[PDB]
Amino acid sequence: QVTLKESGGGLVKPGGSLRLSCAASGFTFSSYSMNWVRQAPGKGLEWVSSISSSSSYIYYADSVKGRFTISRDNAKNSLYLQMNSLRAEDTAVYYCARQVGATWAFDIWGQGTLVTVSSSVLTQPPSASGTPGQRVTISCSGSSSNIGSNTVNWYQQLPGTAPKLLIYSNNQRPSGVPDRFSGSKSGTSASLAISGLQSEDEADYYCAAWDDSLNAWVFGGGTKLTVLGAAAENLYFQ
């Protein structure tokens, strides 16, 4: 059973500190780069930090540089995030995610831990909709330094759950993702097409790519896909 389990969240006053932990089980933890990704309510996924398998290479989002420190203890199968100078804007569910070596896709996500602090470079449409059976395509616009230099990943987030990897390496599907989902990339843009739309596809979809100029991951703001009513099969005139 390959799992990630976060802990350490809670209610903290602005300016306070908190240390998060993420316990890995069911795989060789020391073989993988690891990430922290957070999300505020009704907002998009925001990448926070990553650390290489042997800790040599660390990266931070500009929003947290100097305040947060990532670390790991391979002997304890644990990832950590020491958070200092917390602000209301840091309130979010914090997820840890495992990164695949060859593709950089975040293939396993934890369940999240809630941090409450109280007393997007990629462009995606905020909304998309279709009726069951229609094909819906959503785009993700970037630039030379991100989509123009690296592969695109897509994540599906069913309402109130952790994201899951949907597409990696621009157009590849992990096991379990149906062939109704397909990814494409052209120039500095990418798209996700969902053929034969089903009610179960109602979710938020996020594109992500590494940005060579920022030395950080960039996530799109997310597209909320609504699956509308089936639409009249039978009409009547009198």
Numbering used by the authors: 1 to 119, 137 to 255
Task: Copy text verbatim from the article accompanying this structure deposition.
Mcl-1 (myeloid cell leukaemia 1) is a member of the Bcl-2 (B-cell lymphoma 2) family of pro-survival proteins that regulate programmed cell death via apoptosis. Here, we report the characterization of an antibody fragment produced in vitro against Mcl-1 which was formatted as an scFv and a Fab.
Interestingly, the C-terminal tag remnant formed extensive crystal contacts in both the C2 and P21 CHO-scFv crystal forms, as well as being crucial to crystallizing the scFv complex. As shown by both crystal forms of the CHO-scFv this contributed to the crystal packing, and its removal with carboxypeptidase Y led to a less favourable crystal form and no crystals at all in complex with Mcl-1.
